[PDB]
Amino acid sequence: ENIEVHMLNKGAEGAMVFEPAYIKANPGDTVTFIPVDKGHNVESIKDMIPEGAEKFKSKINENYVLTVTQPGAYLVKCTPHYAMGMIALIAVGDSPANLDQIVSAKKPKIVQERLEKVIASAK
């Protein structure tokens, strides 16, 4: 199954966002990131993807198609806008084993704020 995500300068949660910022997927699915506005990309964050998963980084402004294989939670960022809160959480399979670890991990305050919103209301 494919899930489309838009990379925008401004959206419902404020500036620099992925929409949706919570993606539910199964092994084998793809996530397509579309640069609706210029200046964005997607990058996996170190130690915030599951054991066994490969790290990934797209180029700025390219349409990028991610195939997800390993179950667990993945926190991805937009490289230039991580400090401004531009992240998304991909949850592959049920009860992702590493989710609490990702919620507790060191990250910028605005990122933590948006992450907690997406898990609460966006779940």
What count of residues does the chain have? 123
| Residue 86 binds to Cu ion (criterion: CB under 5 A) | yes
- Shortest distance (Å) from residue 17 CB to Cu ion: 9
Q: Name the segment binding Cu ion (CB under 5 A); options: 17-25, 33-41, 87-95, 115-123.
A: 33-41
Separation between Cα atoms, residue 17 and residue 36, nearest integer Å: 11
- Shortest distance (Å) from residue 93 CB to Cu ion: 27
Q: Which is nearer to Cu ion, 40 or 98 (CB)?
A: 40
Please list the alpha-helical segments (H only) found in the chain.
99-104, 109-120
Q: Name the segment binding Cu ion (CB under 5 A); options: 28-36, 55-63, 74-82, 105-113.
A: 74-82
What DSSP state is assigned to residue 68? -
Q: Name the segment binding Cu ion (CB under 5 A); options: 36-44, 47-55, 67-75, 97-105.
A: 36-44
Peptide bond into 20 cis (omega under 30): yes
Phi and psi for 17 in degrees, rounded to 5? -135, 160
Tokens of 19: 């929409």
List the binding residues for Cu cation.
40, 78, 81, 86
| Residue 81 binds to Cu ion (criterion: CB under 5 A) | yes
Residues of this chain that interact with Cu ion (CB under 5 A) are 40, 78, 81, 86
